Coordinates of C-alpha atoms and ligand atoms in Angstrom, one line a residue:
Chain A
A5 CA 78.8 74.1 82.3
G6 CA 82.2 75.7 82.6
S7 CA 83.1 79.2 81.3
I8 CA 86.7 80.1 81.0
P9 CA 88.1 80.2 84.6
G10 CA 90.1 83.5 83.9
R11 CA 91.0 84.0 87.6
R12 CA 94.8 83.8 87.1
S13 CA 96.9 86.3 85.1
Chain B
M3 CA 92.9 106.3 92.9
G4 CA 93.1 109.7 91.3
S5 CA 96.3 110.7 93.1
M6 CA 98.3 107.5 92.3
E7 CA 100.4 107.2 89.1
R8 CA 99.1 104.9 86.4
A9 CA 102.3 102.8 86.5
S10 CA 102.0 102.5 90.3
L11 CA 98.4 101.3 90.0
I12 CA 99.4 98.6 87.5
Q13 CA 102.3 97.5 89.7
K14 CA 100.1 97.3 92.7
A15 CA 97.5 95.3 90.7
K16 CA 100.2 92.7 90.0
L17 CA 101.2 92.6 93.7
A18 CA 97.5 92.3 94.7
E19 CA 97.1 89.3 92.3
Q20 CA 100.2 87.6 93.9
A21 CA 98.7 88.3 97.4
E22 CA 95.3 87.0 96.3
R23 CA 93.7 90.4 97.2
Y24 CA 91.3 90.6 94.3
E25 CA 89.1 93.4 95.6
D26 CA 92.3 95.6 95.9
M27 CA 93.4 94.4 92.4
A28 CA 90.1 95.4 90.9
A29 CA 90.2 98.8 92.6
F30 CA 93.8 99.4 91.3
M31 CA 92.8 98.4 87.8
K32 CA 89.6 100.6 87.9
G33 CA 91.9 103.5 88.9
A34 CA 94.2 102.6 86.0
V35 CA 91.3 102.6 83.5
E36 CA 90.1 105.9 84.8
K37 CA 93.4 107.5 83.8
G38 CA 91.9 107.6 80.4
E39 CA 94.6 105.8 78.3
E40 CA 94.0 102.6 76.4
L41 CA 95.1 99.4 78.1
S42 CA 97.8 97.1 76.7
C43 CA 97.2 93.3 76.4
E44 CA 98.7 92.5 79.8
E45 CA 96.7 95.4 81.4
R46 CA 93.5 94.1 79.9
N47 CA 94.2 90.7 81.4
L48 CA 94.8 92.3 84.8
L49 CA 91.5 94.1 84.6
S50 CA 89.6 91.0 83.6
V51 CA 91.3 88.7 86.2
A52 CA 90.6 91.1 89.0
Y53 CA 86.9 91.5 88.3
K54 CA 86.3 87.9 87.4
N55 CA 87.7 86.8 90.8
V56 CA 85.6 89.4 92.7
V57 CA 82.3 88.6 90.9
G58 CA 83.2 84.9 91.0
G59 CA 83.2 84.9 94.8
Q60 CA 79.9 86.9 94.8
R61 CA 78.3 84.4 92.4
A62 CA 79.4 81.5 94.5
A63 CA 77.9 83.1 97.6
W64 CA 74.7 84.0 95.8
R65 CA 74.3 80.4 94.7
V66 CA 74.8 79.1 98.2
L67 CA 72.2 81.6 99.6
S68 CA 69.7 81.1 96.8
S69 CA 69.8 77.3 97.4
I70 CA 69.1 77.8 101.1
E71 CA 66.3 80.2 100.3
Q72 CA 64.7 77.8 97.8
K73 CA 64.8 75.0 100.4
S74 CA 63.2 77.3 102.9
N75 CA 60.3 78.0 100.5
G83 CA 62.0 84.6 108.8
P84 CA 63.1 87.2 106.3
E85 CA 66.8 86.8 107.0
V86 CA 67.9 84.4 104.2
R87 CA 66.1 86.4 101.5
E88 CA 67.4 89.6 103.0
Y89 CA 71.0 88.4 103.0
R90 CA 70.7 86.9 99.5
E91 CA 69.3 90.3 98.4
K92 CA 72.3 92.0 99.9
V93 CA 74.8 89.8 98.1
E94 CA 72.8 90.2 94.9
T95 CA 72.9 94.0 95.1
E96 CA 76.6 93.9 95.7
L97 CA 77.1 91.6 92.7
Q98 CA 75.0 93.8 90.5
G99 CA 77.0 96.8 91.7
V100 CA 80.3 95.2 90.6
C101 CA 78.9 94.2 87.3
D102 CA 77.5 97.7 86.7
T103 CA 81.0 99.1 87.6
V104 CA 82.7 96.9 85.0
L105 CA 80.1 97.7 82.4
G106 CA 80.6 101.3 83.1
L107 CA 84.3 101.1 82.5
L108 CA 83.7 99.3 79.2
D109 CA 81.2 102.1 78.2
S110 CA 83.4 104.9 79.5
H111 CA 85.4 104.6 77.4
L112 CA 87.3 101.3 76.8
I113 CA 85.1 99.9 74.0
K114 CA 84.8 103.1 72.0
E115 CA 88.6 103.6 71.9
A116 CA 89.3 99.9 71.0
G117 CA 90.1 99.6 67.3
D118 CA 92.3 96.6 67.1
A119 CA 90.5 93.2 66.9
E120 CA 92.3 91.9 70.0
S121 CA 91.2 94.7 72.2
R122 CA 87.7 95.2 70.8
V123 CA 86.9 91.5 71.0
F124 CA 88.3 91.2 74.5
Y125 CA 86.1 94.1 75.8
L126 CA 83.0 92.9 74.0
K127 CA 83.5 89.4 75.5
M128 CA 83.7 91.1 78.9
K129 CA 80.6 93.0 78.2
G130 CA 78.8 89.8 77.3
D131 CA 80.1 88.1 80.4
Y132 CA 79.0 90.8 82.9
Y133 CA 75.6 91.0 81.3
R134 CA 75.5 87.2 81.7
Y135 CA 76.3 87.5 85.4
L136 CA 73.5 90.1 85.7
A137 CA 71.1 87.7 83.9
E138 CA 71.9 84.9 86.3
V139 CA 70.2 86.9 89.1
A140 CA 67.6 88.7 87.1
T141 CA 63.9 87.8 86.9
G142 CA 61.1 88.4 84.5
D143 CA 61.2 91.1 81.8
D144 CA 64.3 92.7 83.3
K145 CA 65.9 89.3 82.6
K146 CA 64.8 89.7 78.9
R147 CA 66.5 93.0 78.2
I148 CA 69.7 91.9 80.1
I149 CA 69.8 88.7 78.2
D150 CA 69.6 90.6 74.9
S151 CA 72.3 92.9 76.0
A152 CA 74.6 89.9 76.7
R153 CA 73.7 88.3 73.4
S154 CA 74.3 91.5 71.4
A155 CA 77.8 92.0 72.9
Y156 CA 78.8 88.4 72.4
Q157 CA 77.5 88.5 68.8
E158 CA 79.4 91.6 67.8
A159 CA 82.6 90.0 69.4
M160 CA 81.9 86.8 67.4
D161 CA 81.5 88.7 64.2
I162 CA 84.8 90.5 64.6
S163 CA 86.7 87.5 65.8
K164 CA 85.6 85.4 62.8
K165 CA 86.8 88.0 60.4
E166 CA 90.0 89.1 62.1
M167 CA 91.4 86.2 64.2
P168 CA 92.5 82.7 63.4
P169 CA 90.3 79.9 64.8
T170 CA 92.9 79.0 67.4
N171 CA 93.3 82.5 68.9
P172 CA 92.8 82.1 72.6
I173 CA 90.5 85.1 72.9
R174 CA 88.4 83.9 70.0
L175 CA 88.2 80.4 71.6
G176 CA 87.3 81.8 75.1
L177 CA 84.7 84.0 73.6
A178 CA 83.1 81.0 71.8
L179 CA 83.3 79.0 75.0
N180 CA 81.6 81.6 77.1
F181 CA 78.9 82.4 74.4
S182 CA 78.2 78.7 74.3
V183 CA 77.7 78.7 78.1
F184 CA 75.4 81.7 77.6
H185 CA 73.3 79.7 75.1
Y186 CA 73.2 76.6 77.4
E187 CA 72.7 78.2 80.8
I188 CA 71.0 81.6 80.1
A189 CA 69.2 81.5 76.7
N190 CA 67.7 78.0 77.0
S191 CA 69.4 77.1 73.7
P192 CA 71.3 73.9 74.5
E193 CA 71.4 72.9 70.8
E194 CA 73.0 76.2 69.8
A195 CA 75.4 75.8 72.7
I196 CA 76.5 72.3 71.5
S197 CA 76.7 73.4 67.8
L198 CA 78.8 76.4 68.6
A199 CA 81.2 74.4 70.9
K200 CA 81.5 71.6 68.2
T201 CA 82.2 73.9 65.3
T202 CA 84.6 76.0 67.4
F203 CA 86.5 72.9 68.5
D204 CA 86.7 71.4 65.0
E205 CA 87.8 74.6 63.3
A206 CA 90.5 75.1 65.9
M207 CA 91.7 71.5 65.5
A208 CA 92.2 72.1 61.8
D209 CA 94.4 75.2 62.5
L210 CA 96.7 73.7 65.2
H211 CA 99.3 72.8 62.5
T212 CA 100.1 76.5 62.1
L213 CA 101.1 77.0 65.8
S214 CA 104.3 77.0 67.7
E215 CA 104.7 74.7 70.7
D216 CA 103.7 77.4 73.2
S217 CA 100.7 78.6 71.2
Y218 CA 99.6 75.0 70.7
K219 CA 99.6 74.5 74.4
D220 CA 97.4 77.5 75.0
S221 CA 94.9 76.7 72.2
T222 CA 94.6 73.0 73.1
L223 CA 94.0 73.9 76.8
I224 CA 91.0 75.9 75.9
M225 CA 89.8 73.4 73.3
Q226 CA 89.8 70.8 76.2
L227 CA 87.4 73.1 78.1
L228 CA 85.1 73.1 75.0
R229 CA 85.3 69.3 75.0
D230 CA 84.6 69.1 78.7
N231 CA 81.4 71.0 78.2
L232 CA 80.4 68.9 75.2
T233 CA 80.9 65.8 77.3
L234 CA 78.7 67.2 80.0
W235 CA 76.0 68.3 77.5
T236 CA 75.9 65.2 75.4
Chain C
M3 CA 74.2 96.8 112.8
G4 CA 72.3 98.7 115.4
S5 CA 68.9 98.3 113.8
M6 CA 69.1 94.5 113.2
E7 CA 67.8 92.1 115.8
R8 CA 70.4 90.1 117.7
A9 CA 68.9 86.8 116.6
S10 CA 68.9 88.0 113.0
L11 CA 72.6 88.9 113.2
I12 CA 73.4 85.4 114.5
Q13 CA 71.4 83.8 111.8
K14 CA 73.1 85.8 109.1
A15 CA 76.5 85.1 110.6
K16 CA 75.7 81.4 110.1
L17 CA 74.6 82.0 106.5
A18 CA 77.7 84.1 105.9
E19 CA 79.9 81.2 107.1
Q20 CA 78.1 78.8 104.7
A21 CA 78.6 81.3 101.9
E22 CA 82.3 81.8 102.8
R23 CA 81.6 85.5 103.3
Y24 CA 83.8 86.0 106.3
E25 CA 84.0 89.8 106.3
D26 CA 80.2 89.8 106.4
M27 CA 80.3 87.1 109.1
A28 CA 82.6 89.2 111.2
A29 CA 80.5 92.4 110.8
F30 CA 77.3 90.4 111.8
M31 CA 79.1 89.0 114.9
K32 CA 80.5 92.4 115.9
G33 CA 76.9 93.7 115.7
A34 CA 75.8 90.9 117.9
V35 CA 78.4 91.5 120.5
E36 CA 77.5 95.2 120.5
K37 CA 74.0 94.3 121.6
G38 CA 75.6 94.0 125.1
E39 CA 74.5 90.5 126.1
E40 CA 76.9 87.7 126.8
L41 CA 77.6 85.2 124.1
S42 CA 76.7 81.5 124.2
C43 CA 79.3 78.8 123.4
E44 CA 78.2 78.6 119.8
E45 CA 78.1 82.3 119.4
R46 CA 81.6 82.6 120.7
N47 CA 82.7 80.1 118.1
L48 CA 81.0 82.2 115.4
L49 CA 82.8 85.3 116.5
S50 CA 86.1 83.6 116.6
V51 CA 85.7 81.8 113.2
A52 CA 84.7 85.0 111.5
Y53 CA 87.6 87.1 112.6
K54 CA 90.2 84.3 112.3
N55 CA 89.3 83.9 108.7
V56 CA 89.4 87.7 108.0
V57 CA 92.8 88.2 109.8
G58 CA 94.1 84.9 108.3
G59 CA 93.6 86.2 104.8
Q60 CA 95.3 89.5 105.8
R61 CA 98.2 87.6 107.4
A62 CA 98.7 85.5 104.3
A63 CA 98.7 88.6 102.1
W64 CA 101.1 90.5 104.4
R65 CA 103.5 87.5 104.3
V66 CA 103.5 87.5 100.4
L67 CA 104.1 91.2 100.3
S68 CA 106.7 91.2 103.0
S69 CA 108.6 88.5 101.2
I70 CA 108.6 90.5 97.9
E71 CA 109.7 93.6 99.8
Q72 CA 112.6 91.7 101.4
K73 CA 113.8 90.4 98.1
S74 CA 113.6 93.9 96.6
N75 CA 115.9 95.2 99.4
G83 CA 110.1 102.2 93.7
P84 CA 108.0 102.7 96.9
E85 CA 105.0 100.6 95.7
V86 CA 105.7 97.3 97.4
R87 CA 106.4 98.9 100.7
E88 CA 103.4 101.2 100.3
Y89 CA 101.1 98.3 99.6
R90 CA 102.5 96.1 102.4
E91 CA 101.9 99.0 104.7
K92 CA 98.3 99.3 103.5
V93 CA 97.6 95.6 104.2
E94 CA 99.4 95.9 107.5
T95 CA 97.3 98.8 108.6
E96 CA 94.1 97.0 107.6
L97 CA 95.3 93.9 109.6
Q98 CA 96.1 96.0 112.6
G99 CA 92.7 97.6 112.4
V100 CA 90.9 94.3 112.5
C101 CA 93.0 93.1 115.4
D102 CA 92.2 96.4 117.2
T103 CA 88.5 95.8 116.6
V104 CA 88.6 92.3 118.0
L105 CA 90.6 93.4 121.0
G106 CA 88.1 96.3 121.5
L107 CA 85.2 93.9 121.6
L108 CA 87.0 91.7 124.1
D109 CA 87.7 94.8 126.3
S110 CA 84.2 96.3 125.8
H111 CA 82.9 94.2 127.5
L112 CA 83.2 90.5 126.8
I113 CA 86.1 89.6 129.1
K114 CA 84.8 91.5 132.1
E115 CA 81.4 89.8 132.0
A116 CA 82.9 86.3 131.4
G117 CA 82.8 84.4 134.7
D118 CA 82.6 80.8 133.7
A119 CA 85.9 79.2 132.9
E120 CA 84.8 78.2 129.4
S121 CA 84.0 81.7 128.4
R122 CA 86.8 83.5 130.2
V123 CA 89.5 81.2 128.9
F124 CA 88.1 81.4 125.4
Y125 CA 88.2 85.2 125.3
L126 CA 91.6 85.4 126.9
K127 CA 93.0 82.9 124.3
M128 CA 91.5 85.2 121.6
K129 CA 93.2 88.2 123.3
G130 CA 96.5 86.4 123.2
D131 CA 96.0 85.4 119.6
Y132 CA 95.2 88.9 118.3
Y133 CA 98.1 90.5 120.2
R134 CA 100.2 87.7 118.6
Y135 CA 99.0 88.7 115.2
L136 CA 99.9 92.4 116.0
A137 CA 103.3 91.1 117.2
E138 CA 103.9 89.4 113.9
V139 CA 104.0 92.8 112.1
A140 CA 105.4 94.9 114.8
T141 CA 109.0 96.2 115.1
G142 CA 111.3 97.3 117.9
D143 CA 110.0 98.5 121.3
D144 CA 106.4 98.5 120.1
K145 CA 107.0 94.8 119.5
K146 CA 108.1 94.4 123.1
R147 CA 104.9 95.7 124.8
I148 CA 102.7 93.9 122.3
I149 CA 104.5 90.7 122.9
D150 CA 104.0 91.2 126.7
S151 CA 100.3 91.8 126.2
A152 CA 100.0 88.5 124.3
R153 CA 102.0 86.6 126.9
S154 CA 99.9 88.1 129.8
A155 CA 96.6 87.1 128.2
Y156 CA 97.8 83.6 127.3
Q157 CA 99.2 83.2 130.9
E158 CA 96.0 84.2 132.6
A159 CA 94.0 81.8 130.3
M160 CA 96.5 79.0 131.1
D161 CA 96.2 79.6 134.8
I162 CA 92.4 79.4 134.7
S163 CA 92.4 76.4 132.4
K164 CA 94.7 74.3 134.5
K165 CA 92.6 75.0 137.6
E166 CA 89.1 74.6 136.0
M167 CA 89.3 72.3 132.9
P168 CA 90.4 68.7 132.4
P169 CA 93.5 68.3 130.3
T170 CA 91.6 67.0 127.3
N171 CA 89.2 70.0 127.1
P172 CA 89.5 71.3 123.5
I173 CA 89.7 75.0 124.5
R174 CA 92.5 74.2 127.0
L175 CA 94.3 72.2 124.4
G176 CA 94.0 74.8 121.7
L177 CA 95.1 77.5 124.1
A178 CA 98.2 75.5 124.9
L179 CA 98.8 74.8 121.2
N180 CA 98.6 78.5 120.4
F181 CA 100.7 79.6 123.4
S182 CA 103.3 77.1 122.3
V183 CA 103.3 78.7 118.9
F184 CA 103.7 82.1 120.5
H185 CA 106.8 80.8 122.4
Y186 CA 108.3 79.3 119.2
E187 CA 107.5 82.0 116.6
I188 CA 107.2 85.2 118.6
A189 CA 109.0 85.0 121.9
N190 CA 112.2 83.3 120.6
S191 CA 111.6 80.5 123.2
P192 CA 111.6 77.2 121.2
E193 CA 112.5 75.2 124.3
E194 CA 109.5 76.6 126.2
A195 CA 107.3 75.9 123.1
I196 CA 108.5 72.2 122.9
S197 CA 108.1 71.7 126.7
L198 CA 104.6 73.1 126.7
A199 CA 103.5 71.1 123.7
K200 CA 105.0 67.9 125.2
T201 CA 103.5 68.3 128.7
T202 CA 100.1 69.2 127.2
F203 CA 100.1 66.2 124.9
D204 CA 101.1 63.8 127.7
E205 CA 98.6 65.1 130.2
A206 CA 95.8 64.9 127.6
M207 CA 96.8 61.3 126.7
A208 CA 96.5 60.2 130.3
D209 CA 92.9 61.7 130.5
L210 CA 91.5 60.2 127.2
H211 CA 90.2 57.2 129.1
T212 CA 87.5 59.4 130.6
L213 CA 86.0 60.5 127.3
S214 CA 83.1 59.5 125.2
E215 CA 83.7 58.5 121.5
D216 CA 82.8 62.0 120.3
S217 CA 84.9 63.9 122.8
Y218 CA 87.8 61.5 122.2
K219 CA 87.7 62.4 118.5
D220 CA 87.8 66.1 119.2
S221 CA 90.6 65.8 121.8
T222 CA 92.8 63.5 119.7
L223 CA 92.4 65.7 116.7
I224 CA 94.0 68.6 118.6
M225 CA 96.6 66.4 120.2
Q226 CA 97.7 65.5 116.7
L227 CA 98.3 69.2 115.9
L228 CA 100.5 69.4 119.0
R229 CA 102.4 66.3 117.8
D230 CA 102.7 67.8 114.3
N231 CA 104.4 70.9 115.8
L232 CA 106.6 68.7 117.9
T233 CA 107.7 66.8 114.8
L234 CA 108.5 70.0 113.0
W235 CA 110.4 71.4 116.0
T236 CA 112.4 68.4 117.0
Chain D
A5 CA 104.4 76.0 113.2
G6 CA 100.7 75.5 113.1
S7 CA 98.2 77.2 115.4
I8 CA 94.7 75.9 115.7
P9 CA 93.1 76.4 112.2
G10 CA 89.8 77.7 113.7
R11 CA 88.4 78.8 110.4
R12 CA 85.3 76.4 110.4
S13 CA 82.4 76.5 112.9
Ligands
V2K301 C1 88.4 85.1 77.8 C2 89.7 84.4 77.9 C3 90.2 83.7 76.8 C4 91.4 83.1 76.8 C5 92.1 83.1 78.0 N1 93.4 82.4 78.0 C6 93.7 81.2 78.6 C7 92.8 80.4 79.5 N2 95.0 80.9 78.4 C8 95.5 81.9 77.5 C9 96.7 82.1 76.9 C10 96.9 83.2 76.1 O1 98.2 83.4 75.5 C11 98.1 84.2 74.3 C12 95.9 84.1 75.9 C13 94.7 83.9 76.5 C14 94.5 82.8 77.3 C15 91.7 83.7 79.1 C16 90.4 84.4 79.1
V2K302 C1 91.0 77.8 120.1 C2 90.3 76.5 119.7 C3 90.3 75.4 120.5 C4 89.7 74.2 120.0 C5 88.9 74.2 118.9 N1 88.2 73.0 118.5 C6 88.5 72.2 117.5 C7 89.6 72.3 116.5 N2 87.7 71.2 117.5 C8 86.8 71.4 118.6 C9 85.7 70.6 119.1 C10 85.0 71.1 120.2 O1 83.9 70.4 120.7 C11 83.7 70.6 122.1 C12 85.4 72.3 120.8 C13 86.5 73.0 120.3 C14 87.2 72.5 119.2 C15 88.8 75.4 118.1 C16 89.5 76.5 118.5
CL303 CL1 92.4 103.0 69.9
CL304 CL1 78.7 86.6 133.2

């Protein structure tokens, strides 16, 4: 399903 | 990036994030890692965000091309899928190389070591998504081993609401479901993680509560899709 | 891309568009242009879409960085804005070079020649957005000259509802407003274009009507913002 | 204002 998005930091 | 100051690389990584220039961001952060010093918490986040965005675009493109190729079954779709796949593998190999030279070995605190071992699991997982056959087997085991070591440390050293511990469990659960053909393990891990975090929320400030509950909702979203 | 067949380059450009890999798409289409044959209508669209997406991302990044730099007024923000700017200029120079070697000179039909001259105006306009001083003046004149030649041909050879004629007028109006400091000319051109298209809609099929009215709405959207 | 988007074809 969904992994942690982790595209904003 | 050998001639650029470490601080300048970090500053430019932040600017590249604002400009949505993730390839640049990743190159700046690779340069920063190669200075040889350990990374702070914020610097680890910059490294991870940069490469997750780069490889995320490659994965999305690979899935588009792989779907077209599967529907087709000239050489062009396979050739182009292969090109994107090789690029993706190259980025994953680069990240894994930074972790192995020498981020993990210098990471002693639980927060840094778990963070890097979770990354190692994630980039082996991305390699496993495009692997076939026996190569797939060893790559899958490498991802599993990294995630497991991270899990063992996180359970000993971090509270159940810690965002890194939660995100590690979330991603390891996705590994079980999507890679390892272990949906029951995926569901069990997501459930136990969610429930143990729930029981620890009372200890948190408002800001920490917001972070932890946001990730717990992602665990719940997967459980709803899987059950 | 010299060793890849023309047809394979075109096919891969289409796949790259589906995969949202616009840098690849542009490289494939550059390779196709460099085979030396004229481009069909669909191939011209692939070339334009590829480079518009590449340069569009660069422009958006340049605007983010330029805004940060203006608010700041170390060297890092200026250095990184300059890096993005040089890359952007390089892509515009590449497109202009394809148009000059030898797409425009071989384009005899109004549809191809107007299309390429509109592109020439657009990429000089993107160069003008980042230019300063006297360099800005000659670049602005180059954009104006290209747009004007395209306009002259389009008014003689195409109906007022033709989508290329409409998009050329739309973009030339943006040039007047945003680049040439001629908002009245921009408004006049958008108005006259819209009204002359309106009066020609009765000649169109349902499908052509949809295309023409979509672009006419963009002209109207600008007029609403400008008045 | 807005030029033609031209990012899909
Ligand atoms: C791998 C991973 C885990 C957790 C995060 N994450 C998110 C989504 N929000 C966070 C807030 C934090 O404040 C301490 C820390 C981590 C957070 C991202 C990636
Ligand atoms: C420069 C330019 C002009 C026009 C288009 N465009 C759009 C937005 N829709 C179109 C439909 C067409 O069918 C004939 C042709 C051109 C169209 C794009 C870019
Ligand atoms: Cl250490
Ligand atoms: Cl010709």
